Amino acid sequence: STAGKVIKCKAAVLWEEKKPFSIEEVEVAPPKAHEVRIKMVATGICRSDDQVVSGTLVTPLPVIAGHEAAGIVESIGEGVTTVRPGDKVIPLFTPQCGKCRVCKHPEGNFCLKNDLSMPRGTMQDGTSRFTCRGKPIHHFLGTSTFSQYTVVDEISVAKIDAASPLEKVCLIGCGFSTGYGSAVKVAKVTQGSTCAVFGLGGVGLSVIMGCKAAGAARIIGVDINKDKFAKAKEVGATECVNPQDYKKPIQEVLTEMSNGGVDFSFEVIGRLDTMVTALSCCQEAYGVSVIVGVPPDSQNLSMNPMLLLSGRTWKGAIFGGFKSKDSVPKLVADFMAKKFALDPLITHVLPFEKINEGFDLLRSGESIRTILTF
Amino acid sequence: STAGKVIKCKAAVLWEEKKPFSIEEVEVAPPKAHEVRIKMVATGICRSDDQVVSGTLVTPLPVIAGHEAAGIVESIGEGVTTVRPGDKVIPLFTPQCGKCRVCKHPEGNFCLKNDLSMPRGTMQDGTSRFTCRGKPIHHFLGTSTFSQYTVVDEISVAKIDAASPLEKVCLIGCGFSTGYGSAVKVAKVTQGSTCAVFGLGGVGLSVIMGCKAAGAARIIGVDINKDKFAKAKEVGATECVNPQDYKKPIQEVLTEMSNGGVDFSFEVIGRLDTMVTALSCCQEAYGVSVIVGVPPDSQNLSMNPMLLLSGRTWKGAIFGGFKSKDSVPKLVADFMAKKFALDPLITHVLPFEKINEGFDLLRSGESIRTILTF
Ligand SMILES: NC(=O)C1=CN([C@@H]2O[C@H](COP(=O)(O)OP(=O)(O)OC[C@H]3O[C@@H](n4cnc5c(N)ncnc54)[C@H](O)[C@@H]3O)[C@@H](O)[C@H]2O)C=CC1
Ligand SMILES: NC(=O)C1=CN([C@@H]2O[C@H](COP(=O)(O)OP(=O)(O)OC[C@H]3O[C@@H](n4cnc5c(N)ncnc54)[C@H](O)[C@@H]3O)[C@@H](O)[C@H]2O)C=CC1
Numbered sequence: 001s002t003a004g005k006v007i008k009c010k011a012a013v014l015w016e017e018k019k020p021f022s023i024e025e026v027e028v029a030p031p032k033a034h035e036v037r038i039k040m041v042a043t044g045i046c047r048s049d050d051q052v053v054s055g056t057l058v059t060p061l062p063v064i065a066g067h068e069a070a071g072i073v074e075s076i077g078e079g080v081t082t083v084r085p086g087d088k089v090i091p092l093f094t095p096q097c098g099k100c101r102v103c104k105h106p107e108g109n110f111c112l113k114n115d116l117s118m119p120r121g122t123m124q125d126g127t128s129r130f131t132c133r134g135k136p137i138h139h140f141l142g143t144s145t146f147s148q149y150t151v152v153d154e155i156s157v158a159k160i161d162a163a164s165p166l167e168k169v170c171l172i173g174c175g176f177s178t179g180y181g182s183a184v185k186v187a188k189v190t191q192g193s194t195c196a197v198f199g200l201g202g203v204g205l206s207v208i209m210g211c212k213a214a215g216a217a218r219i220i221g222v223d224i225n226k227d228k229f230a231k232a233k234e235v236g237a238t239e240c241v242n243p244q245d246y247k248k249p250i251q252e253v254l255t256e257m258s259n260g261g262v263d264f265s266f267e268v269i270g271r272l273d274t275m276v277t278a279l280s281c282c283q284e285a286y287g288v289s290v291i292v293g294v295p296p297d298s299q300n301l302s303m304n305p306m307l308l309l310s311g312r313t314w315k316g317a318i319f320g321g322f323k324s325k326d327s328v329p330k331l332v333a334d335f336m337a338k339k340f341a342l343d344p345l346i347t348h349v350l351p352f353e354k355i356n357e358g359f360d361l362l363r364s365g366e367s368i369r370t371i372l373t374f
Numbered sequence: 375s376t377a378g379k380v381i382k383c384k385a386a387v388l389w390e391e392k393k394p395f396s397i398e399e400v401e402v403a404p405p406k407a408h409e410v411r412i413k414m415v416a417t418g419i420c421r422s423d424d425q426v427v428s429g430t431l432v433t434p435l436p437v438i439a440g441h442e443a444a445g446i447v448e449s450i451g452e453g454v455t456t457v458r459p460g461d462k463v464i465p466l467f468t469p470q471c472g473k474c475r476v477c478k479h480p481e482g483n484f485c486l487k488n489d490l491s492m493p494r495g496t497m498q499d500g501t502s503r504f505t506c507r508g509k510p511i512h513h514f515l516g517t518s519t520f521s522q523y524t525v526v527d528e529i530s531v532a533k534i535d536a537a538s539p540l541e542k543v544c545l546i547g548c549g550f551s552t553g554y555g556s557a558v559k560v561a562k563v564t565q566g567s568t569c570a571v572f573g574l575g576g577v578g579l580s581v582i583m584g585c586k587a588a589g590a591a592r593i594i595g596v597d598i599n600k601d602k603f604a605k606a607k608e609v610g611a612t613e614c615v616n617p618q619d620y621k622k623p624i625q626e627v628l629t630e631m632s633n634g635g636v637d638f639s640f641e642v643i644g645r646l647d648t649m650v651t652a653l654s655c656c657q658e659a660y661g662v663s664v665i666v667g668v669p670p671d672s673q674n675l676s677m678n679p680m681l682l683l684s685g686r687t688w689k690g691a692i693f694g695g696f697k698s699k700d701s702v703p704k705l706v707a708d709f710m711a712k713k714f715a716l717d718p719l720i721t722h723v724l725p726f727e728k729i730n731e732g733f734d735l736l737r738s739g740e741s742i743r744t745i746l747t748f
């Protein structure tokens with residue numbers, strides 16, 4: 001009988017860029033029509049949430065960040081049909097309305113109801129469910145998972161297996177699905193191909209998992225932090241290279257290593273220069289390069305379109321190209337059936353109250369995924 | 375007999391950039407091992423040849439330009455197995471060695487023996503078969519068709535049907551195949567899709583022919599020269615737009631016209647700005663944009679990689695992605711079988727001696743293809 005009532009609970013509020021989060025009481029309004037209020041159980045720390053703190057991923061502040069999570073439905077608003085109270089759910093930072101031209105397209109996943117392209121930091125109705133110190137607080141990507149309770153639109157939540165371990169499957173809400181799908185769905189990596197993966201964090205490791213699942217013969221991990229190489233090899237990298245070790249640009253190194261360029265490359269960092277390097281290192285006639293990393297806000301890259309004229313394909317994707325609400329429950333079912341592993345991404349576990357310590361671990365280079373438990 | 379002897383003949387020599395072609399006597403050496411000497415019958419004037427004159431497509435000078443042609447084999451060197459004297463042939467500006475990693479790849483066509491990436495202006499053996507006034511003259515793309523006779527490597531020639539009309543099928547050597555293949559093979563335009571085509575010259579009109587052949591429902595032609603619109607509609611454009619008629623950037627106009635972005639766009643001009651505009655006007659989640667136009671040498675474009683992160687695909691191709699020696703004879707057979715039309719591309723037919731007048735028709739906006747006859 002919190003149904004229909006304001007919930008007071010602890011959240012991690014970001015009042016200002018480049019500051020620690022503030023763990024303090026917020027008010028969470030009850031769900032309106034076609035909204036769902038969720039008791040959070042676990043949430044991952046994704047680099048994207050750090051990019052909000054840095055101001056390189058722009059969204060209105062003050063904000064409740066967090067987008068990679070799982071929890072249990074506390075209550076549903078009028079007209080909700082796809083979840084019920086007590087269901088295990090993953091919030092969907094890329095919604096799936098099922099009605100727009102993108103949701104109807106066989107390839108498209110970047111649903112037109114998204115709050116990513118022109119971020120408002122609201123619910124679909126352009127309002128906020130969060131108050132803190134009597135002030136309205138923004139949502140983030142329609143999820144806001146750094147809170148003991150959040151409210152999401154129905155098109156931004158999926159029901160998952162009632163027996164799911166939420167402290168693992170939260171990663172299906174961002175890192176795992178994004179990297180894995182970038183390899184298997186967006187690039188469509190082929191058997192016996194040579195792949196290069198720039199960035200060996202939680203998302204790059206999931207790209208290597210996808211490239212190994214698709215049968216790549218060679219998977220070259222690229223990182224300036226050599227501490228990341230051991231885990232990259234554990235999940236399928238065949239060799240790792242640190243650009244800092246070489247006199248020549250790493251695109252020339254990777255072209256040499258692959259006897260004329262790789263089949264597939266992935267940028268999984270968020271830098272303009274590595275997006276161009278990753279395109280250049282794929283074979284000039286038939287290579288494919290996928291951008292996964294989030295670039296610094298409003299900045300343009302410079303490149304020579306002759307890289308494309310010879311035959312390269314350049315593409316990007318959100319959330320591994322997966323239609324979110326269709327895909328997430330299937331990915332959970334596949335995890336439950338041991339079709340892929342999440343433990344290699346989880347390097348640290350902390351209670352929610354130690355969220356700043358978890359951000360310090362990511363910023364130091366020491367962690368892949370820290371899972372926060374409520 | 376001419377076999378085994380130097381031929382003295384008329385060619386159009388380009389001694390330096392931004393000068394008219396010089397019609398004069400050249401000496402054409404006999405073919406060496408694995409070379410083919412061709413009597414030219416017809417050659418088209420392609421914008422790429424004008425870009426050599428402008429200095430925006432860099433190749434060593436002085437040069438015999440011309441790459442879109444057909445002729446008859448005069449003689450063969452030792453070891454030639456794929457053509458014989460008397461055969462009708464089309465020179466291949468993109469070769470097909472059949473042995474390199476690209477030629478062996480199911481998608482690749484940019485054969486590693488090409489003279490496009492790092493142009494030397496020679497035969498495969500690094501020498502020239504042309505002299506003029508006692509000076510060696512460079513080849514262009516392994517073809518050099520602005521000459522009564524040329525010598526090509528065997529991997530740069532295809533045998534075609536003995537009954538084909540060379541004054542039309544010369545366009546299968548460049549413009550038609552480039553535009554048609556960019557639509558049907560590189561973009562893989564789908565039935566009922568909406569396409570935008572930037573540039574309505576000979577290659578852009580061939581892109582429209584391919585989009586119509588693939589069953590596109592809407593084909594929007596874009597040109598600053600409204601005199602190009604009537605012929606674009608004859609070969610399948612459903613509507614034409616001139617960016618100069620609008621207050622808003624044309625990417626915004628096309629996104630509005632297509633109710634949120636086109637399925638397929640094509641840049642068929644050669645400008646950095648229209649390459650970015652064409653990418654932007656394709657739907658952000660599932661759009662495909664193909665670069666066909668040749669950009670100005672050594673210039674980089676500037677773009678926001680968020681255009682790709684949402685889901686766009688950006689790709690370019692040489693020669694419509696066709697593997698050149700396999701494809702050109704089949705395209706000629708398909709033309710003989712009335713599967714497509716070439717007459718709509720031909721606006722002017724001039725004697726070879728009128729090459730400069732042909733180029734002035736292209737520069738003035740008055741022609742699509744001028745065919746020069748020997
Ligand atoms: N497209 C999408 O849907 C999603 C994109 N993102 C983005 O993916 C990127 C990766 O996220 P995570 O794996 O969580 O981050 P992470 O920070 O854990 O991993 C990035 C890795 O890149 C390495 N790196 C940094 N600079 C480098 C350089 N110059 N050259 C080579 N390696 C370098 C770092 O050492 C680190 O190991 C971030 O930009 C993030 O915002 C994350 C998930 C969703
Ligand atoms: N990728 C490949 O294998 C090939 C590429 N090319 C390139 O394709 C391009 C087109 O070649 P052609 O059709 O022979 O050229 P063309 O000059 O006949 O056609 C170009 C059209 O673009 C239009 N145009 C110029 N500026 C424009 C602007 N700012 N906005 C909109 N329209 C504009 C012109 O009015 C003209 O109708 C050239 O860059 C050529 O070098 C041609 C053939 C093979």
Ligand SMILES: [Zn+2]
Pocket residue numbers: 095096097098099100101102103111112113
């Ligand atoms: Zn939708």
Ligand SMILES: [Zn+2]
Pocket residue numbers: 046047048049067068174175
């Ligand atoms: Zn994320």
Ligand SMILES: [Zn+2]
Pocket residue numbers: 469470471472473474475476477485486487
């Ligand atoms: Zn080859």
Ligand SMILES: [Zn+2]
Pocket residue numbers: 420421422423441442548549
């Ligand atoms: Zn051409």
